[PDB]
Design a protein around this ligand. Structure first.
Ligand SMILES: [Zn+2]
Ligand SMILES: [Zn+2]
Lengths: 401, 397
């Protein structure tokens, strides 16, 4: 017969979906693949187990009927600005619509983004109502404490030349180091320089929108926003060693209020557990903090991570604002965050920040003083005085056991 | 220099088992496929590429050792019993001290620490008089004292293949093919038996004394919870997840207070291990389908998108229980027949099954729990029949 069609080209950042080309990361037809890697982050490993055990056909293709976004997001000019969005596929939510022809031609194209709605009921919001900080309105916040949200799950899609620029290194070096430091994950990183797009086996993020997603692209609508990096031990389990769930739920409260007043709110939840070191390293460091000579002091907080991990933080907030540009955000009126790394990345990428909203002191959990004092001393935003050397030397961390 | 140390999976001593060497500081010492920290090896690569981290860096493990001694237990050296984590992975600094000193760069794959966990649901349990602080397990602040262990995945491929009733050769070929060619050593290095996959692991929360988990005479209350970010963190009312998790935590605290021990394992398998994008696509299809969001269509909506109902493969889930020495679960705070079958099929007796109280089912979670009960999840009461399952129990939008 004939050789069917080859792999469709990708022109990253092109002005239209058709010129950009679809990300084809499925494996039903190897000849159509035009990226390195596969969809769903880490969960490609579980898909492989499902095929190996006979539960899933390696020929299966998704039926996308009725799955399209509940809310229209974009397109926006940022989707085609050179180098602006390099770690997600701006077209990834609307593939069934914008690549309908390519799907009909036989290219097996999966969404990398999904957009739905939810009622989120957080205990802290229920308490906020009881305390008179929040008042149900029936539209954004119900008397039950439920907040109506749009939520979008975004899986990672990396344009390697653009990622390299974002980190000020050559694409060749980025790709060689990705290959070497993963123990040889995906040799195409070094053997297929013609493939520009990489679907890494990492978690993505989820955006929670309070109000109308279209207002995110209108700087005349007051936007309250937080980008939160995953901390399972607090975000789920409420460990009192850190500030994470308190800051997350404070931000959610402020987003609900912002929407109620006629604005819009945004919380992005990014899968970067333990400063992207993972939870094992995180717990090893907790142990060293508590056992060190002199006790758990803020002046040693970062040193304890450096000794185990060789760096303080591997989250690389340089890629974090891509989701904001995807949503059309040009201005954040209230940024519910303190990190100078996040603030520098956001403003450095062209997003104006007006008010910085620090975490209220009464929300710092009982053993989180070491963390927050160390962060303020390291340059995180605070409206008042930064802890001095003497304050940072106080043994504020609880003993082990 | 020296070559790669051999691995003899399931050996009775750490020295004979050999260390998992999954670092990249000396390629000649590597004796596994893949690298440590699950997905976060990718971020380590960015750190090296950007100049922030030296590719020569080795951890200083000083003072990082477990806060609680877990094992060794007989299960650690029973052939085929533990195939998806390294039983020695928490104690490498102790049991592989000689190998570390000889220049093998060996990382822990498990870390064990302590915490005070303060959950709003537990504080409310106290306020409502369901829980009473005792000063040792539960404080008046609502804090519960726990031991917690983070466990990253370490797969013995011959053992995983057996667990899944397929040949190791086929398992490794399919892993290679269905990931788009991730790690060709899966097919080119059959001599490497151990694989460190780029997936999330799990976290165990222990209420009481970890040593009691290995004593079937001590009443054990346990739940294995699979990650649901949209509920576990954000409290979406479409599912039962955070309610069941926090109910289990309440029951574990009480079990410890009565002189027993409690265990919650939190496993990183978002969306039935399909991931969150697929999960949300299915929510949309559920709400838009002709006839509305009905329990009799709940599983079909996932099948249409994903080709299967569930990819969590609970057949590997009991490994952590065997690592902890668990031989009996007196109170299993769970309903899933797949979890129950996997636990009991691995030889662990389950005495009481503790279903989720009806009053804890969130406002839009009735479709989910009714479909699950009809699918065989444990319930003491009536199973919904065909007519009940056809009711439009799901909220619009
Ligand atoms: Zn935290
Ligand atoms: Zn759930």
């Amino acid at each position: 017969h004939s050789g069917g069609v080859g792999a469709l080209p990708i022109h990253w950042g092109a002005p239209t979906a058709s010129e950009r080309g679809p990300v084809v990361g499925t494996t039903t037809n190897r000849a159509h693949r035009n990226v390195i890697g596969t969809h769903s982050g880490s969960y490609s490993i579980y898909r492989a187990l499902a095929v190996a055990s006979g539960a899933l056909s390696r020929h299966h293709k998704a039926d996308l009927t009725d799955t399209a976004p509940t809310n229209i997001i974009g397109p926006y000019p940022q989707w085609s600005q050179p180098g602006k969005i390099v770690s997600l596929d701006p077209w990834g939510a609307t593939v069934a619509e914008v690549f309908a022809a390519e799907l009909a031609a036989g290219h097996d194209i999966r969404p990398s983004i999904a957009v739905t709605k939810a009622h989120v009921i957080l205990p802290e919001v229920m308490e906020a109502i009881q305390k008179g900080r929040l008042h149900p309105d029936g539209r954004f916040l119900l008397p039950s404490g439920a907040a109506l949200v749009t939520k979008a799950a975004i899986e990672p899609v990396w344009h390697l030349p653009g990622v390299a620029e974002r980190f000020h290194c050559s694409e060749t070096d980025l790709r060689r180091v990705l290959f070497e430091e993963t123990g040889g994950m995906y040799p195409e990183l070094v053997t297929r320089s013609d493939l520009e797009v990489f679907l890494p086996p990492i978690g993505g993020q989820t955006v929670y929108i309070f109000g109308d997603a279209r207002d995110l692209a209108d700087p005349g609508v007051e936007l309250t926003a937080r980008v939160h990096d995953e901390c399972n031990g607090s975000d789920v389990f409420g460990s009192d060693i850190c500030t994470c769930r308190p800051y997350l739920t404070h931000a959610i409260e402020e987003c609900i209020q912002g929407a109620q007043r006629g604005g819009v709110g945004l919380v992005a939840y990014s899968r970067k557990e333990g400063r992207a070191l993972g939870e094992v390293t995180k717990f090893l460091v907790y142990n060293a903090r508590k056992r060190q000579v002199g006790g758990d002091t803020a002046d040693q907080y970062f040193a304890r991570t450096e000794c185990v991990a060789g760096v303080q933080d591997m989250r690389f907030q340089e890629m974090m604002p891509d989701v904001l540009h995807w949503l059309g955000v040009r201005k954040i009126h209230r940024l519910v965050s303190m990190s100078n790394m996040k603030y520098d990345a956001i403003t450095g990428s062209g997003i104006e920040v007006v008010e910085r909203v620090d975490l209220p002191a009464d929300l710092i959990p009982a053993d989180a003083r070491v963390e927050i004092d160390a962060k303020m001393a390291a340059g995180y935003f605070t409206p008042g005085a930064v802890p001095d050397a003497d304050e940072l030397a106080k043994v504020k961390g609880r003993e082990l056991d």
